[PDB]
Design a protein around this motif. Structure first.
Motif, short mmCIF file in Angstrom:
data_model
loop_
_atom_site.label_atom_id
_atom_site.label_comp_id
_atom_site.label_asym_id
_atom_site.label_seq_id
_atom_site.Cartn_x
_atom_site.Cartn_y
_atom_site.Cartn_z
N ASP A 93 7.96 16.58 -4.43
CA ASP A 93 6.69 15.88 -4.54
C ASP A 93 6.44 14.87 -3.45
O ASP A 93 5.28 14.68 -3.07
CB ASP A 93 6.57 15.14 -5.88
N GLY A 94 7.47 14.22 -2.95
CA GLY A 94 7.26 13.24 -1.91
C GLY A 94 6.63 11.99 -2.48
O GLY A 94 7.25 11.31 -3.31
N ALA A 95 5.40 11.71 -2.03
CA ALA A 95 4.60 10.54 -2.43
C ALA A 95 4.55 10.39 -3.94
O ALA A 95 4.84 9.31 -4.47
CB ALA A 95 3.19 10.69 -1.88
N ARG A 96 4.18 11.47 -4.62
CA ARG A 96 4.12 11.48 -6.06
C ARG A 96 5.48 11.16 -6.65
O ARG A 96 5.58 10.43 -7.63
CB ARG A 96 3.64 12.83 -6.54
N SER A 97 6.54 11.69 -6.04
CA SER A 97 7.87 11.38 -6.53
C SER A 97 8.30 9.98 -6.14
O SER A 97 9.16 9.42 -6.81
CB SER A 97 8.88 12.40 -6.02
N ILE A 98 7.73 9.41 -5.07
CA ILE A 98 8.11 8.06 -4.67
C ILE A 98 7.59 7.12 -5.72
O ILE A 98 8.35 6.50 -6.47
CB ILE A 98 7.49 7.58 -3.35
N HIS A 99 6.26 7.08 -5.79
CA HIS A 99 5.55 6.20 -6.69
C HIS A 99 5.86 6.54 -8.13
O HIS A 99 5.84 5.65 -8.99
CB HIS A 99 4.08 6.26 -6.34
N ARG A 100 6.19 7.79 -8.39
CA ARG A 100 6.60 8.23 -9.69
C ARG A 100 7.92 7.55 -10.01
O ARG A 100 7.96 6.70 -10.89
CB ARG A 100 6.73 9.74 -9.72
N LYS A 101 8.97 7.87 -9.26
CA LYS A 101 10.29 7.28 -9.53
C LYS A 101 10.30 5.78 -9.34
O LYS A 101 10.96 5.06 -10.09
CB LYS A 101 11.34 7.93 -8.66
N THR A 102 9.57 5.27 -8.35
CA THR A 102 9.59 3.82 -8.26
C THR A 102 8.61 3.26 -9.28
O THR A 102 7.92 4.00 -9.99
CB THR A 102 9.28 3.34 -6.85
N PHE A 103 8.56 1.94 -9.38
CA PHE A 103 7.65 1.31 -10.30
C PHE A 103 6.19 1.51 -9.90
O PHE A 103 5.54 2.47 -10.33
CB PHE A 103 7.97 -0.18 -10.39
N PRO A 119 0.88 -1.17 0.00
CA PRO A 119 0.00 0.00 0.00
C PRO A 119 0.91 1.21 0.00
O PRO A 119 1.88 1.26 0.76
CB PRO A 119 -0.79 -0.13 1.30
N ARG A 120 0.61 2.14 -0.91
CA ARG A 120 1.39 3.35 -1.10
C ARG A 120 1.61 4.12 0.19
O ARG A 120 2.70 4.64 0.41
CB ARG A 120 0.70 4.20 -2.16
N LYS A 121 0.60 4.11 1.07
CA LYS A 121 0.59 4.79 2.36
C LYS A 121 1.78 4.42 3.20
O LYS A 121 2.35 5.26 3.89
CB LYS A 121 -0.69 4.41 3.11
N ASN A 122 2.18 3.15 3.14
CA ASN A 122 3.33 2.69 3.89
C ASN A 122 4.60 3.31 3.36
O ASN A 122 5.45 3.76 4.13
CB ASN A 122 3.40 1.18 3.83
N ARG A 123 4.74 3.33 2.03
CA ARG A 123 5.91 3.92 1.40
C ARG A 123 5.99 5.40 1.71
O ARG A 123 7.07 5.93 2.02
CB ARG A 123 5.84 3.71 -0.10
#
Ligand SMILES: Nc1ncnc2c1ncn2[C@@H]1O[C@H](COP(=O)(O)OP(=O)(O)OP(=O)(O)O)[C@@H](O)[C@H]1O
Ligand SMILES: Nc1ncnc2c1ncn2[C@@H]1O[C@H](COP(=O)(O)OP(=O)(O)O)[C@@H](O)[C@H]1O
Ligand SMILES: Nc1ncnc2c1ncn2[C@@H]1O[C@H](COP(=O)(O)OP(=O)(O)O)[C@@H](O)[C@H]1O
Lengths: 370, 370, 69, 24, 370
Positions: free
Chosen positions: E360-370, E111-115
């Protein structure tokens, strides 16, 4: 026709097939005196079964083979059973098949030990053992429901959906009223009511049934009861002693709501049941919200359904309506459920006969469990 | 006996039935092969052990829903035995296999094997008097009144475009694909795990389909709305649990236009239909632009056809008037079309007699199926 | 033939939700042997089972092939 | 419409005919 | 930063740590969060009430040990933060977040929330300059040197197969199941209660794990070895007290292939891997067959892999050669692969700067990660 024998964790209950009142209503407790240098009193028993032990309770060592239902010495209860026959019905176990009680998460060796006693010892023509919660829901008249079973030695919520096996959510819990009575006599000891033996325990468990109720807001009710001096009610005991109980009445059952009092490393009964709830399909749990089957004779408490209900209601969604199923006769509905259960057509075929056991050994207990 | 024939509105996800002449099928139910996964503890429990209908639509927390029609294509003939076995219930029929003619339907581009084995079933096990099985697209056109028209028909693990001019033998031009909502819903279970919803049951999948038809729409802007901030539509379970959605509701059907999102090379409904257009002729193509028969319940979305209109507008050249026809009953259009076709007198040759298949084989009917 | 006909008709009459509902009324209302003493007192199960037993024999008989012809 | 009410899985408020904005 | 990168082997049940320049993790310990279950008045006990290391590794019967990574997913992040501070403490690193490059581990489709929550910690509370966290599968790929393969990384309480050929991801084939060995240990205490052993504590669960990692294996034949007579190996307690075993030791991890015992539907993760095989390319499969990736300490059973080889023989076609890739210290293998990855200089684009989180944080996490 058969032998509907209930094995209450505290007291006992029994009778034939289809009997309405439980005949062997006596303490399922074992007792023996202090076998010492003195001689016999005009000739008397060695072991004291129930009411006999209850009678001369000042010396008879009130014990139990029962360990929250787990019988250690089977000799005790089996002699009790023999005398129970020849006490209540005076019938031999070989002419009528027997019906017994059980609780989940029980080591199979217990039931197999039991089984071999009935066959090798009692020579019952047929036999059967089932869960008390089944008889409770049987008395309710349902097949879908979370049967929160609560004996005075153990507790086990039984979620059912049309008489189906859901043991992953069904959880045994050795919660006894005796444990509460332990803590109760302990807190009484610091209240000047310092008592030690099990006779004291018998008196105070009856007092527990007298005035120990369930409040609604334990801390608020505790502070008000501390202020409510009139709530600290008294009762001159059989002995010259009197009591004083205002908090204690509801202070003691909070250990069920809070394992912290005993350090049980568990959850409170309400959310424990809710944890068992959490192990299922939430949409059939909706039915289980409606199937709030509060069972077990150790639920005969004042202000308990609203307490538990409100707790899990706070845990439940608004749409998830709690609908308590709790007849005051649930204590008897165990044995009476088995008594009328004996009259079931399929059950008159569903049996464990002599050769069925002997020719299968104790292995037949597994498939003949439920 | 050649009485009112049973018009069976089949379907990958929703396979239901009714009769001919009637405008309402009395047996409306989807595709679902469930069966309990527990042990009957308490007798008197509701049984059948293969639950379909209200049983399955009631006892969702116990069944293992199976599916032979994988992408509409049957993979389990034994599941078909059980499917018709439940269908053959008189509470589901009120008849026999011979009391009425049967009218079953198909989907284009399917093997013979299907018709073969099914003919064996309904003419050997079951003993149907007269029956013919063919594409639902023709029946949909019957319900539209049109003859020349591209039938965009979609199952639930099926999505396909059927170009038709007065029902002519054009299987090269006629296309078919087998991919839809089942997989999309499974991808929504993937969405669930990404969101944190830990679900893996087919009963839960049913609820996802309830959301699919209920709390799931379409948009027209893919990347634009993707960049646009959503609202995370909180769905509520039968329990009532908050279930946010976000733009996933229309993001998942983008895969229907972008098949590689699931890792499956194709060209999207639109381009596949355009390929079907390519196989047609320029003059007839304009008719088919005006003659678009969208069908299938899977096609029910907000601006579904409107988005697709924009798609083909970006695909089709200038001065091309595209016109869609898509009733609100994109299911029963086939059922009513079979209700009309089955109600014909010329239909004698269209059906196949029982004894005919019993004489030589299904290859005769395969000649009749083209 | 007419046996099975009436068996299924009376069977559906029995299977009405009111009858079954009243069985639920009684047994949940502690009249614990409504379906027990009800289903056991039915031979309908065995009668339909017997017609299913003798089902292909009573079927495809050449009655009119000899009598009417 | 009555048959549209008789069966459950039927939605409304969407025209069954979708055409292009055929610019005259 | 130009410092040694912190290599953390954050496994759901075993969270080890170290650095890249070191081929051995020096800070190895499992998942555990203990809170003192006892009051302390007299001096002699140290405090902090959240003990990691020695205190938790000695005073097991005193601390309410918590395993905050619920299926590798933690919600009590605060405790984890304190464990990370414990890592920053004198016992483990004596350093800061800002002072070092950091490297943690991940599970697929979390779940993205954890990341997001983790990034909040490491870039708001902790302030790592450059950091990236990824799948444990890549770490295993470094531990094997392979690039082609189905990384079967099945840790303590998560089981997942990661099919990746030559360093190319295939998420549709990539599967993940959040249940593993932790639950088999749960099932082991279920066996304890089957024969009456109320060892409910987390410390008691560790004792259970000691038996799990001490006397448990995999008998390749299921019923052929289960239905036999067992010797009931007398295990020795943390008192050395004798406790028999029964068939339990080998029949306990069977649940991993028949989750029906716990009331769950699955196939046995290896079959899910076979589904991934089916999701892959025909002859490219054979390579992945030979890519038998072995990961997660839960794989430690005698006859484990061979039982899975038998599973392969039951399900895979002939001559599709499979080749066991065993790791020596499987748990360190992951950590050492992380040490290799963290020691990569090119990691520039692969890491994520702190300012990037500030952008961006979250957006950059999920963005840069798969
Ligand atoms: N008026 C009352 N007030 C408080 N508690 C009561 C009252 N009446 C009964 N109880 C509870 O009922 C318990 C005994 O009932 P129960 O049926 O559980 O006995 P049991 O021996 O456990 O039977 P079984 O083992 O068959 O369940 C006592 O522990 C007591 O706490
Ligand atoms: N509003 C909706 N949104 C998405 N899918 C739908 C909706 N309504 C129905 N469906 C799906 O469309 C399918 C029905 O279309 P039909 O041509 O009858 O297909 P099927 O072959 O699946 O029965 C159903 O299986 C259903 O799952
Ligand atoms: N001999 C064994 N038998 C069964 N399980 C084991 C054994 N040794 C280790 N394990 C399990 O595997 C885990 C270590 O695997 P790991 O990949 O670190 O799990 P995670 O990554 O989920 O922490 C331990 O937590 C333990 O539960």
């Amino acid at each position: 026709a058969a032998l509907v024998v209930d094995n209450g964790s505290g007291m006992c209950k029994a009778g034939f097939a289809g009997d309405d009142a439980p005949r062997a209503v006596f303490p399922s407790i074992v007792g023996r005196p202090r076998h010492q240098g003195v001689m016999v009193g005009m000739g008397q028993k060695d072991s004291y079964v129930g009411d006999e032990a209850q009678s001369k309770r000042g010396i008879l060592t009130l014990k139990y083979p029962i360990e929250h239902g787990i019988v250690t010495n089977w000799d005790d209860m089996e002699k009790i059973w023999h005398h129970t026959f020849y006490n209540e019905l005076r019938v031999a176990p070989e002419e009528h098949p027997v019906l017994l009680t059980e609780a989940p998460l029980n080591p199979k060796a217990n039931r197999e030990k039991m089984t071999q006693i009935m066959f090798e010892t009692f020579n019952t023509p047929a036999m059967y053992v089932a869960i008390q919660a089944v008889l409770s829901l049987y008395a309710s008249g349902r097949t879908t429901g979370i049967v929160m079973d609560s004996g005075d030695g153990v507790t086990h919520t039984v979620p059912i959906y049309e008489g189906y096996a859901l043991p992953h959510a069904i959880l045994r819990l050795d919660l006894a009223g005796r444990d509460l009575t332990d803590y109760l006599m302990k807190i009484l000891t610091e209240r000047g009511y310092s008592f030690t033996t099990t006779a004291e325990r018998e008196i105070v468990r009856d007092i527990k049934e007298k005035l120990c109720y369930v409040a609604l807001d334990f801390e608020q009710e505790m502070a008000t009861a501390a202020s409510s001096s009139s709530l600290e009610k008294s009762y001159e005991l059989p002995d010259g002693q009197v009591i004083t109980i205002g908090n204690e009445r509801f202070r003691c059952p909070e250990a069920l709501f809070q394992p912290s009092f005993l350090g049980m490393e568990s959850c409170g009964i309400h959310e424990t049941t809710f944890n068992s709830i959490m192990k299922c399909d939430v949409d059939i749990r909706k039915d289980l919200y409606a199937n709030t089957v509060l069972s077990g004779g150790t639920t005969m408490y004042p202000g308990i359904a609203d307490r538990m209900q409100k707790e899990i209601t706070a845990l439940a969604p608004s749409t998830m309506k709690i609908k308590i199923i709790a007849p005051p006769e649930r204590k008897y509905s165990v044995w009476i459920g088995g008594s009328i259960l004996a009259s079931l057509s399929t059950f008159q075929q569903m049996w464990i006969s002599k050769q069925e056991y002997d020719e299968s050994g104790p292995s037949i207990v597994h498939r003949k469990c439920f | 006996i050649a009485n009112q024939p049973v018009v069976i509105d089949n379907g990958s996800g929703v396979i239901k039935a009714g009769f001919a002449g009637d405008q309402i099928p009395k047996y409306c139910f989807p595709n679902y092969v469930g069966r309990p996964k527990h042990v009957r503890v308490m007798a008197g429990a509701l049984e059948g052990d293969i639950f379909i209908g209200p049983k399955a639509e009631e006892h969702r927390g116990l069944l293992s829903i199976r599916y032979p029609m994988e992408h509409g294509i049957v993979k389990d003939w034994n599941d078909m035995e059980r499917i018709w076995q439940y269908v053959y219930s008189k509470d589901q029929l009120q008849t026999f296999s011979e009391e009425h003619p049967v009218l079953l339907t198909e989907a284009p581009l399917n093997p013979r094997k299907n018709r073969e084995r099914a003919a064996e079933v309904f003419f050997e096990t079951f003993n149907v008097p007269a029956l013919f099985i063919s594409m639902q697209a023709v029946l949909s056109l019957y319900a539209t009144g049109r003859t020349t028209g591209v039938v965009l028909d979609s199952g639930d693990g099926v999505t396909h475009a059927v170009p038709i001019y007065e029902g002519f033998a054009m299987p090269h031009s006629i296309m078919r694909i087998d991919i839809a909502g089942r997989d999309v819903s499974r991808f929504l279970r993937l969405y669930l795990r990404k969101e944190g919803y830990d679900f893996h049951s087919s009963s839960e999948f049913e609820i996802v389909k309830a959301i699919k038809e209920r709390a799931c729409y379409l948009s027209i802007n893919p990347q634009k709305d993707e960049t646009l901030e959503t609202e995370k539509a909180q769905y509520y379970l039968p329990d009532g649990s908050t279930i946010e959605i976000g733009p996933s509701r229309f993001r998942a059907p983008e895969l229907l236009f972008r098949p590689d999102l699931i890792g499956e090379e194709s060209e999207g409904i639109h381009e596949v239909l355009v390929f079907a257009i390519q196989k047609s002729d320029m003059d007839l193509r304009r008719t088919l632009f005006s003659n678009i028969v969208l069908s299938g319940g899977s096609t029910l979305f907000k601006g579904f056809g409107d988005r697709l209109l924009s798609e083909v507008k970006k695909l089709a050249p200038k001065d091309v008037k595209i016109r869609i026809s898509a009733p609100q009953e994109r299911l029963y259009s086939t059922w009513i079309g079979g209700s009309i076709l089955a109600s014909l007198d010329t239909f004698k040759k269209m059906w196949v007699s029982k004894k005919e298949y019993e004489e030589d084989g299904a290859r005769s009917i395969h000649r009749k199926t083209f | 033939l007419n046996l099975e006909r009436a068996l299924y008709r009376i069977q559906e009459k029995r299977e009405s939700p009111e009858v079954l509902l009243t069985l639920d009324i009684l047994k949940h209302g502690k009249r614990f042997h409504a379906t027990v003493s009800f289903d056991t007192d039915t031979g309908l199960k065995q009668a339909l089972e017997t017609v299913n037993d003798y089902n292909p024999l009573m079927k495809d008989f050449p009655l009119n092939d000899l009598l009417s012809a | 419409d009555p048959k549209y009410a008789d069966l459950p899985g039927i939605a409304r408020n969407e025209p069954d005919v979708y055409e292009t904005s055929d610019l005259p």
